[PDB]
């Protein structure tokens, strides 16, 4: 057991040994971006491929070219933390080595005269933080993977929704990675047509004419040949035995039914036929007589009676024709040739040029390059390696592994396979099959956008080289880095898949980095999506979680990676499986994709195994081709590696998931991502054992990079002295972990790292040193454990309402810390420069009490709504004051000032503590006093780590000096090393001071920015949304007094009272099981607390702990005898607040184990206690379910949802009230509200809400004046939107008017 796990061992109720540990949760991001940036010697992945796809650049004339050598990424200007602080993108500069070469016109090409090689800068590539995030414009963002159609050929049909006939029209469609789409469809008259770029249909034969195929060759490829001869004045077939199986059979006794197998045992190579058998048949070749000089019969022409005689007179004796059936073979290609109008390649090229470019005059040379550019050009068409493999697998081609452009055989085989599907052989491809859908991650998207930018620069470079004036030009004159930087910035800042990082809790972190979206560029549309894509395909087993998909329009279109899912080298999801050999089951596993899954049978973890390592039941449950069933034991091929393989990380954290309906499990998984961290993090009493993995892999915790002993612990710094086995020679020997303290998250939530270590104790690698938000001792801890009674209480838990005690409000169990940003930007205006100062006109002294001399509030100031944070004065123009106003000014004095008060004030209903102030000044502007104080504060904070490092290095050096004390030589060496260390420290501090003192690249027009961080402690109140982990959401209806809530015999009151009515209908029974198990766990916890209190001997404590950890026939073997005395005491101390129990999904604790633990805790086996009413004292006549449940505080607070408005700001054009709390807007009275008032008959209320409240400009002012006067009468007028409509209609030249 690790040190961080030995402190609090969670009891495991699982029964199936674990073979494969859960891999890194964020591998999908890290591996993709590492492939993007890392060097590729073979150049198939990463920026190497992007450079090799465009470079070298050839000019039109061929005078010169630009070539590529290598690339590198420089040292970043900043790190992640200060990149967030200033608001700049964390990135590395791209520096590429290029050589310019010039070729002479007189001299033959390929002669190198001189080369000019150097390193040019072509933009800045955003780097990915170790946790898998990007810092763009100072904000943390996640690039979300995209599930898209795999490149290649897809065969599908219509199912019969085009025409009322029972016929089904089949079609095929090729999707390139880069290129133009190509379709082959069937019309409802048995003809095959071609569609290029979704244009109007053309006969398919055109795409063969254009490829040098004469009609004879077309008939040869697309049909089989049956031959005829004239032997002894008799017509003659050939021998193909499978064809015959009825006029007669000229094989003597082998004759039949004037079944063929009867005499097919004996073979003869002759069949005679009448003349009539040929009349209905069609030709296969072209026959020309030299004497006549004309064409008697054409290919694909119906043979007539006189045709036979004329051919015989011509001297031809061999006649080969096509082969046509009604079931197995068809005339589709022949009829398509009959409906085409072209006869030669160039005429077809003219036809496709007319279609591609409607109205353009027919030009031949243009036609040639158009077709060569459409599919056969590497620049405009690119079938990727994955697309190439899908192509070679679909049509059966076995070569051209590196080719990326279509050729003759590709289209030939696509046509052949589609005709074979129309015949009956073969089946269509499943569109939703995960072997037909691919995962595209950060690396591929970045490659694509980088290549787009490279093309943007390629055009200009080619043009400049085509000018030809190349005498003094080094390569950093054709390369323009700004377009490439613009492309990468566009992708990383304005893409639909580049989203703000959901940062409520570590589970939000992980789920956002493991999300797969079918939307985005090259994806789907919410309104245009269908049922089929949203549905759960059977290939999702172990690849996509069937549970967590958002409720609503985005249902099914957004999925989550399963626990063990992985991406192969081609981008297809694969999942692990344990192989079986000789009937035994092996530890080592193989990763299989959707295509490979269909062939084998796959058992699952629930299958019972023997002590010999093999299946027990003869008929084990397994899957074939997506169908579950019972299969023989000896037929098995693979078994699942874990019970949580089909469910993702969020759903793997729901205890007793197998006892919940899928709907409520989905609601719980989605709702567990919205939890808000609290002041104190407490572990879940009932968990699943996955919390440690999520907490460690989220990155919120501080994980020890190397083992050793903690030299020093502080709330902000942890210094670890590394053991002398992991010390690289020459290293200082210490590691410093700086902890984030009260940093605003993306969702205005505190991010705080709390030390969980002492000074001097030993730590190993991977151990947790600090706990981040929603983490307790290395375990994920979202909500709090609440005592729960399942019983109705006077309607205060009606529907999903929740009744909450005052004890938990007083104990601050659900109090949260929210950090808010407020910015004051002093700009430069036409009248003058806006100034940040404390000399605010028309404001007294009390409002300036919290302001400093500069005009910025102090750190630690308690502010409320309306208080000034930054004092700012704005120059203003002359005001033409009204006559009574100048009366007031004349009588009372009080001359007007030249500045108006435009100051940053705290928003209403917001009251908190100022915790940080940041001042950003444009270069060349006088830095105010507060900016100087902040600068010195940051310098003083920043020199400490360098000071400690220099001190320890100099102490080691002086110890070496004393130990050494030939002599003078060692003294001189020590002195020079000391000087080198001093110089290194000076350089580091110089770089630091340069960073803090460096000015800020602000936006044009702004002179100063002041940023204030406000911390607000939000307590739990009625209207707040609280939830469990089983879809049982609710809104608090009352904060009940303690004496009024139900209590037990010992006097302990409940904390939350929940309605039982919502359990049976909603089919979430895992919650009741969680309540019972939590009751047992807290019972065991209080037993350990008692044993601690009266200081019982350690022998009894050890015996009880061993008894607890040995309950049930589980997979966990915990030996308390192997723990030290202090370790046992620490374990007992951490188990005082309850025994944490792990119930893995689909491997959970049975009811027998729950009742056994309830018995061990001296509690009723039914889990129901006798409660007493606090108000009356009378016991409830039925026992009530009481226990402990993990409650979450969702980020749906009534504080930021309550909104009210009487009169505020209005829209510019519509003259209607704004929309939104942030804008102080009004509610929308839509169409259905108008319908409801029309149904009621409220004409006057409707008129008032239409005119006065919304857009009657004079009406609302008059109504306000009347209400102030106390009249409550209105004089309605014309709505402004109707006048806008009249003006807009008149602008269309339409005379609309009002008559009298």
């Amino acid at each position: 057991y690790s040190y961080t796990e030995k402190k609090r061992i969670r009891k495991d109720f699982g029964t199936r040994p674990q073979v494969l540990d859960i891999p890194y949760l964020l591998s999908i991001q890290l591996d993709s971006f590492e492939k993007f940036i890392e060097q590729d010697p073979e150049g198939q992945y990463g920026l190497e491929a992007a450079f090799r796809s465009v470079f070298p650049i050839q000019s039109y004339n061929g005078n010169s070219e630009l070539q590529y050598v290598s690339y590198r990424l420089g040292e970043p200007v900043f790190d992640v933390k200060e990149c967030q602080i200033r608001g700049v993108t964390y990135s590395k500069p791209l520096r590429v080595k290029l050589r310019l070469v010039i070729f002479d016109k007189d001299a033959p090409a390929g002669t190198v005269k001189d080369i000019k090689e150097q390193e040019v800068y072509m933009g800045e590539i955003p780097l990915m933080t170790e946790n898998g995030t990007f810092v763009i414009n100072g904000t943390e963002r996640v690039i979300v993977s995209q599930l898209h159609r795999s490149p290649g050929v897809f065969f599908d049909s219509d199912k019969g929704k085009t025409h009322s006939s029972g016929k089904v029209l089949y079609n095929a469609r090729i999707i390139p990675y880069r290129g133009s789409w190509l379709d082959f469809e069937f019309d409802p008259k048995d003809n095959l047509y071609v569609r290029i770029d979704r244009r109007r249909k053309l006969p398919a034969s055109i795409i063969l004419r254009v490829l040098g195929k004469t009609s004879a060759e077309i008939l040869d490829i697309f049909f089989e040949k049956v031959n005829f001869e004239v032997k002894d004045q008799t017509l003659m077939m050939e021998l193909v035995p499978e064809r015959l199986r009825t006029f007669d059979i000229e094989a003597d006794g082998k004759v039949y039914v004037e079944h063929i197998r009867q005499l097919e045992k004996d073979g003869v190579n002759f069949i005679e036929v009448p003349v009539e058998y040929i009349v209905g048949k069609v030709s296969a070749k072209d026959y020309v007589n030299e004497a006549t000089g004309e064409l008697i019969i054409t290919a694909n022409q119906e043979i007539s009676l006189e045709a036979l005689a004329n051919l015989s007179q011509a001297g031809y004796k061999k006649l080969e024709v096509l082969f046509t059936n009604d079931l197995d073979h068809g005339p589709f290609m022949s009829e398509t040739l009959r409906v085409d109008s072209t006869t030669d390649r160039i005429s077809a090229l003219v036809e496709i040029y007319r279609m591609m470019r409607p109205g353009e005059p027919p030009t031949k040379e243009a036609a040639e390059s158009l077709f060569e550019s459409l599919f056969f050009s590497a620049e405009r068409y690119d079938l990727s390696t994955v697309g190439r493999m899908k192509f070679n697998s679909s049509i059966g081609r076995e070569d051209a592994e590196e080719q990326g452009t279509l050729d003759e055989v590709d289209i030939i085989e696509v046509m052949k396979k589609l005709i074979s599907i129309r015949n009956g052989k073969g089946e269509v491809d499943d569109i939703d099959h995960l072997g037909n859908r691919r995962i595209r991650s950060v690396g591929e998207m970045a490659e694509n956008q980088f290549r787009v930018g490279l093309v943007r620069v390629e055009r200009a470079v080619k043009e400049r080289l085509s000018l030809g004036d190349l005498d003094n030009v080094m390569p950093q004159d054709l390369i323009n880095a700004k377009p490439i930087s613009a492309a990468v910035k566009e992708f990383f800042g304005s893409s639909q898949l580049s989203q703000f990082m959901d940062q409520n809790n570590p589970l939000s972190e992980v789920t956002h980095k493991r999300r797969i979206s079918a939307l985005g560029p090259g994806g789907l549309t919410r309104e245009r999506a269908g049922f089929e894509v949203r549905d759960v395909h059977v290939t999702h087993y172990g690849r996509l979680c069937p549970i967590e998909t958002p409720e609503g329009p985005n249902i099914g279109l957004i999925n989550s990676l399963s626990a063990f899912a992985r991406c192969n080298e081609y981008g297809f999801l694969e999942t692990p499986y344990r192989r079986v050999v000789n009937g035994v089951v092996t530890d080592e596993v193989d990763y299989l994709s959707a295509i490979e899954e269909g062939q084998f049978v796959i058992a699952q973890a629930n299958a019972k195994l023997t002590e010999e390592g093999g299946f027990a039941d003869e008929l084990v449950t397994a899957r074939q081709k997506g169908e579950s069933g019972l299969h023989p034991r000896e037929h098995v091929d693979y078994m699942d590696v874990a019970t949580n393989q089909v469910v993702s990380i969020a759903a793997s954290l729901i205890p007793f998931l197998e006892h919940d309906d899928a709907n409520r499990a989905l609601m719980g998984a989605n709702m567990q991502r919205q939890a808000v961290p609290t002041l104190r993090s407490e572990k879940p009493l009932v968990g699943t054992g996955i919390e440690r993995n999520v907490a460690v892999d989220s990155g919120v915790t501080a994980v020890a990079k190397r083992g050793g002993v903690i030299q020093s612990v502080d709330a902000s710094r942890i210094v670890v002295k590394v053991n002398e086995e992991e010390l690289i020679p020459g290293e200082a020997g210490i590691d410093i972990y700086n902890l984030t303290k009260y940093t605003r998250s993306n969702q205005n939530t505190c991010i705080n790292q709390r030390p969980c270590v002492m000074p001097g104790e030993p730590v190993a690698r991977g151990d947790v040193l600090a706990d981040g938000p929603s983490t307790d001792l290395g375990e994920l801890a979202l909500g709090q454990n609440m005592r729960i009674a399942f019983m109705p209480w006077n309607g205060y838990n009606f529907e999903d309402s929740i009744l909450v005690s005052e004890r938990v409000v007083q104990d601050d169990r659900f109090t949260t810390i929210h950090i808010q940003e407020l910015s004051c930007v002093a700009r430069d205006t036409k009248l003058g420069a806006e100034e940040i100062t404390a000399d605010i006109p028309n404001v007294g002294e009390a409002a300036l009490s919290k302001l400093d001399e500069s005009g910025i509030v102090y750190i630690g100031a308690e502010v409320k709504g309306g208080d000034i944070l930054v004092g700012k004065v704005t120059p203003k123009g002359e005001t033409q004051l009204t006559p009574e106003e100048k009366l007031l000014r004349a009588i009372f004095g009080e001359k007007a000032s030249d500045v108006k008060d435009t100051s940053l004030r705290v928003p209403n209903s917001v009251a908190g503590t100022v915790i940080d102030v940041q001042v950003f000044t444009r270069d060349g502007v006088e830095k105010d006093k507060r900016a100087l104080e902040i600068e010195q504060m940051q310098l003083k904070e920043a020199k400490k780590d360098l000071t400690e490092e220099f001190q320890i290095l100099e102490g080691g050096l002086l110890a070496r000096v004393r130990s050494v004390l030939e002599l003078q030589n060692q003294l001189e060496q020590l002195a020079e090393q000391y000087d080198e260390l001093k110089a290194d420290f000076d350089k580091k501090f110089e770089a630091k001071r340069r960073k803090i003192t460096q000015g800020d690249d602000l936006a044009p027009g702004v002179l100063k920015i002041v940023k204030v961080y406000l911390a607000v402690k939000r307590r739990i109140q009625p209207g707040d949304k609280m939830a469990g982990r089983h879809g049982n959401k609710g809104v608090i209806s009352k904060i009940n007094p303690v004496e009024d809530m139900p209590y037990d015999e010992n006097g302990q009151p409940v904390d939350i009272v929940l309605n039982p009515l919502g359990v049976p209908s909603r089919m979430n029974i895992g919650q009741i099981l969680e309540v019972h198990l939590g009751l047992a766990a807290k019972g065991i916890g209080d037993k350990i607390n008692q044993m601690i209190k009266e200081q019982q001997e350690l022998a009894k404590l050890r015996e009880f702990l061993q008894k607890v950890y040995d309950l049930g026939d589980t997979r966990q073997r915990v030996d308390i005898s192997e723990l030290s005395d202090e370790d046992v005491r620490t374990l007992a101390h951490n188990l005082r607040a309850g025994l944490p129990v792990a119930t893995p999904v689909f491997d959970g604790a049975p009811e027998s184990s729950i009742k056994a633990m309830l018995e061990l805790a001296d509690l009723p086996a039914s889990g129901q206690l006798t409660l007493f009413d606090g108000r009356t004292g009378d016991a409830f006549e039925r026992p009530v379910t009481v226990g402990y449940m993990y409650m979450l505080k969702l980020n749906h607070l009534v504080d930021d949802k309550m909104h009210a408005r009487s009169t505020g700001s209005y829209s510019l054009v519509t003259q209607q009230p704004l929309g939104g709390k942030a804008q102080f807007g009004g509610q929308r009275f839509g169409e259905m509200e108008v319908w409801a008032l029309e149904a009621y008959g409220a004409a006057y209320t409707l008129q008032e809400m239409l005119t006065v409240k919304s857009d009657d400009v004079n009406g609302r002012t008059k109504m306000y004046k009347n209400i102030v006067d106390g009249n409550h009468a209105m004089e309605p007028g014309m709505p402004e939107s109707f006048n806008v409509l009249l003006k807009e209609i008149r602008s269309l030249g339409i005379n609309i008017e009002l008559e009298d």
């Binding site: 800068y121 950093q476 004159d477 390369i479 430069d828 270069d923 060349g924 044009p1004």
Partner: protein
């Protein structure tokens, strides 16, 4: 003036690897820094009121 501003910023960005600052960009164009800023603060193409 704006086009020359952009071109010289391009050359300096290629030469020194970073985006030019309004100080350094003044001396290579032999025109005062205040007027460099004034040209920079020229309103760009207005953003449409229909943008999502």
């Amino acid at each position: 003036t704006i086009n020359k501003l952009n071109r010289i910023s391009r050359q300096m960005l290629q030469e020194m690897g970073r985006e030019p600052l309004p100080e350094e960009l003044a001396e290579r164009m032999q025109m005062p820094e205040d007027k460099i800023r004034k040209v920079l603060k020229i309103a760009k193409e207005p953003i449409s009121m229909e943008t999502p």
